[PDB]
Amino acid sequence: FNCYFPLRSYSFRPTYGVGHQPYRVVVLSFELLHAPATVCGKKSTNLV
Amino acid sequence: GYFKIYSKHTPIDLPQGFSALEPLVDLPIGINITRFQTLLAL
Ligand SMILES: *[C@@H]1O[C@H](CO)[C@@H](O)[C@H](O)[C@H]1NC(C)=O
């Protein structure tokens, strides 16, 4: 009575709907702090 | 926030002479430093 197990299985199957297929997610969060900007994205043209 | 290390090695009471210390590494470690200690192998 009243006690259940809150973790339930997704139970993915190939025959499911488009919304019932597994869709992996990758989340990026950017942080700027009092550090010398150690991560950055730099194109260099040939010299003349 | 940068820790800078200059180094020089010479094959020899400190000797009387002039030698210039070239830079070795420059690191953006960024922590606060107040004291220090040394390690020996024994
Ligand atoms: C770094 O450490 C020194 C220790 O003498 C302290 O006085 C200083 O306030 C510290 N810097 C910061 C940003 O807390």
d(CA A28, CA B14): 55
PDB experimental method: cryo-EM
| CA B7, B11, B16, B20 torsion-angle sign | negative
> How many Cα atoms occupy the beta-carbon half-sphere of A43 within 13 Å?
1
List the resolution, Å: 3.0
d(CA A24, CA A34): 33
Q: Which residues contact B8 (CB under 8 A, 6 or more apart)?
A: B19, B20, B21, B22
Amino acid (1-letter code) at residue A41: G
Residues of B in Cβ contact (< 8 Å) with A36:
1-2, 28, 30
Three-state DSSP at B23 gives strand
The protein residue with its alpha carbon nearest to ligand 1, atom 10, reads B32
The protein residue with its alpha carbon nearest to ligand 1, atom 1, reads B32
Phi, psi of A19 (to 5 degrees): -80, -5
Residues of B in Cβ contact (< 8 Å) with A35:
1, 28, 30
d(CA A31, CA A46): 34
Three-state DSSP at B16 gives coil
